[PDB]
């Protein structure tokens, strides 16, 4: 949160990249670090490689590199997913009477819908387009 | 609650007045980040990106998703609506339907062509049995090798129709000729007719294998696509 | 035994112990490897012009070669015969005592003044109505040279004179450790001691290493040269 | 304007041919982005000598300042563009130009240790005793950075 | 939108894009999903995508109401939009696989040159690529350009002099301007995050920096301006790395008529003339093509060899197999004529179509040659006599199969509905291929057999 | 085989009496004689 | 450690369980959250 492209690269991306060793059937590794405070390192493996073995080998090398990352990045945590997959469908959730914001709708979907759709027969993965609520403390410097 | 966060004590002044968090900040339930603004026809929008599970049925999964969302309808706040901007199941529905249509129309076309030339319903019924048997068999081989019903494997069977239909026509037509030219009964005519083509049909099977099988041994993404058509056509041809 | 599952199971249990280990041990990085105990080959690196010392070569190998070799399939373990450079702060106890300072003050000052700070953005989300400017805020960044570490301010005396880190310590680029010193025919050298990953083919892995080394050679500094002082794989190929 | 924004990108990119065509068609030389950088600011920063000369020939403000009071001479001096520092000074660049921080081209040149530029600035009458908001001179920066060669020049 | 463009400015453009699709394309467009702040090539306030969802294919008759038409009309309409790059484009056939048209190039920093020098080396390559329109087209960076950023220096001496700790300064700045994830709370039985951050109006412009105060050891409140200085500089809003080294991804494609393999060879030639310590590599579709291209020759060889060996065993001769293998072009010419006429491409569906077309044409010839050879071997008939008797017997079953199969693929050729692009690629190449394979083979197969039999014994 | 090693005993009473913290003693001894990995820096574009 | 069954269910069990979707050959999932702060989530898979 609040990190620039260079901060993310030089504290997170470089540290993780250096620890992506001893992993089998790796073809190439690519990453980008942006000014939104985000890093995405994609590791592409040989065709016919077990995606589960590939993922756990990457996860395991990341876990041992976690103590080398900043405290704020350890808090947020670091997701390791199979990205090669695509979407079956996109369920849109909207508000027509203009009583709910995108934040209000996202929280309802996260709380009352997502889990039930995840448990539905034949559903492999569910991704929320938005986030659940957060307790926002909007500080005032004049009052502080 | 926001109320409790508001009452968080920061400082107690000399005079005894209390400085709470709500005195130095605005407190509300908001988003984790505000980088993305999502709108559906101008209206505030969220959504769920759903992926299909390994070895699952897309058409069954989509039906089950719509059934589960229908049970949630009664508990939705006023104004909340479900929409389907992206859905890939209509494809697979039409892809399977248009395949079934082509294979049915193919059998109907063979029946008409068989009757036009041979002019007996008994002759037209042999391909009408043989073709379905080969097609069903192909699915069993498809399942055995761990392949799925998809756009590539579905059009793979359509592209193989010519080879399947030919095997049926060649065998029956050749018997009808032998009888017409030599006057042999059906049984004796079939023994001789098969005696002429049995060696070639086996040869043809080996030749066509050599054309399609090596196509499956390409590497990467292109190889994966080719392997769908290769294994489907070779299996269908081999059973035919 | 499947080496992949063995490694997974061993690491699953290690992760329960990791939190109980001293912070200094965790920050050195704990590793879990599946490899032979013996070396597959030793990739040696020398400078024929003598323009780079053993320390210079060791840093270049560690910084430009080792990581890519370590990521190559079949490479279970890579031992650097030498050390990568670190910013060495060689403290002086006489000078520290003179200015009433300790290694604790030096460590605190370095953590404070060699910092990569997330400072946010101008016109960041959620923004006010009518914002035209959006730009990243850049604060402190990691120091890049001995000079920058040198002018780290430890304290300001009562008279106003500044105590810099270079006043209480000598500052240079030097190995993380000074334990491992390698030579090739009595000549300054570094190298990578490569161990074969469990079950991996020795010859295929050797070929993959040479292919990756070939991609590095074109961008070497003047004099730097790969030598092959120990390889078990030529025997395997030739014997057959 | 359209051409004004095309000139900013062209000046930054160092496309000498595109700048020429824009000067003929009359692209605004005083055009400024949201941070207040002119084509001359950008040309000076990225070190495009020929475009700096072309822009100054077409009546560009040599003493243009951004929203933090920094001028093209600040940028040229800071990023070690000797030939651009000379051209700017020859066309009447304020050698003692102070930004909102009280920082001068000499302060910036001294900090990065550009010995040639420091002497060029001093030759055009750079105030060696000039202090920033913290009361620091070019000499204070030189002894703090430990640049003995630079420290010797400023006396 | 251009560099440093805000969320509000991007939203106004997406509103125009949304308004157009629900106004000018009311009959075609069902919904517009406007995602402000995200782009595939890079994120930020200056980027956004509008996902357009159309009505059912049945409610969109004719090419005029298809995606390619709507795309062209939309791209032309949005050309007029000022200070924003706006264009529509269709999805790839397989979304899993990506665009998969052109090449995917990685420019690599191999000797710690740095971001600025890699940019200069990139600009040099793009400039040189632009001098060859005849070979390379739309050679561009995939990533984002450097943007103005607000560099603030904390004066260590002034902070220590005033008794203000650096942790307090960097926490105050980071928390207020950037936001800070403090800890978790439980909202209606669900764990959720607590974020502290400045209210919008106090973290917008550089003047707001001075309104933030930090408490010193002596208890005095010191403004941020007292111990800080600020200047504008340029920096990357998105830094790329490839195999652990700093990189910049470059996309491009072969010019009309030229193959991708040729376009790659030029990019390699141009790359070798770049400054010292600047390397390159091929990734994605390019990496896949180079390895797939290296396999093709050996697979074609194995295919032809085994085909010949099987026929040689069937007919018990090294020569007669050639009489069958000579039909290959008779079917391929018809597929190419039909593909070139209808304006389709040499795609996967067309390529598999050729093999099945070649397959059935080969089958027709195999039986003609078998019968002709059998008549000569067993009944002792002459070459021409046996050939004439073979083609006579083979005429009816060849015409029955051809008539049935040509009519069978007719719906796929003329289909304009859902999945028609595939059906067209299947039917077109097969129909045209079958027509020529049927018409030519019945006349050319007997010529092949007679000529081969005459030449060898 | 076993080797001579320099055994040093910190006196807790004296440390407490002089107002010297045990954290400062252990860090001073450990950092000086053993070495301390403080944090990372960037050497020509690479974290070290 | 120190957490009641309700607290640890809301902060651990449900957080884990809601991520245990799209695993191959999953028959059923049973879990318990107790007063010692202990969570145990058992996933049973298809025979073979
Ligand atoms: C020429 C005839 C020869 C006989 C052999 C050919 C058999 C038919 C070929 C297609 C094989 C797959 O057939 C396909 O199976 C899947 C289940 O996996 C079905 O899938 C779906 O069916 C119905 C269709 O309304 C849905 O409501 C349901 O949710 C789902 O199960 C398809 O509707 C069916 O068409
Ligand atoms: C009915 C029977 C069907 C028969 C099916 C037979 C199985 C097919 C075997 C496929 C095995 C792959 O075949 C193997 O591919 C590799 C590439 O990866 C080739 O390797 C190739 O590399 C270089 C690349 O510059 C080529 O120039 C060269 O012509 C060739 O040697 C091997 O020469 C080939 O033997």
Author numbering:
A (entry chain B): 50 to 193
B (entry chain B): 242 to 481
C (entry chain A): 98 to 337
D (entry chain D): 12 to 166
E (entry chain B): 578 to 1034
F (entry chain A): 722 to 769
G (entry chain C): 50 to 97
Can you quote the paper on this entry?
Homotrimeric AcrB is comprised of three protomers that cycle interdependently through the loose (L), tight (T), and open (O) conformational states during H+/drug antiport catalysis. Characterisation of resistant E. coli mutants and structural biology analyses indicate that the compounds bind to a unique site on the transmembrane domain of the AcrB L protomer, lined by key catalytic residues involved in proton relay.
From the identified inhibitor binding pocket, the protonated piperazine moiety of the pyridylpiperazine forms a critical salt bridge with the side chain of D408. In addition, the formation of a salt bridge between the charged piperazine ring and the carboxyl side chain of D408 reinforces the importance of the basic nitrogen of the piperazine ring for activity. From the crystal co-structure, it is apparent that the pyridylpiperazine EPIs bind uniquely to the L protomer of AcrB. Firstly, by binding deep in the TM domain of the L protomer, the pyridylpiperazine may sterically prevent the L to T transition, a vital process involving major structural movement in the TM domain from an inward open to an outward open conformation. An alternative possible mechanism of action is that the pyridylpiperazine impedes AcrB from using the proton motive force as its energy source for substrate translocation. The reason why no pyridylpiperazine was observed in the T protomer may be of technical nature, where the transition from the L to T protomer may not occur in purified AcrB due to the presence of the stabilizing DARPins.
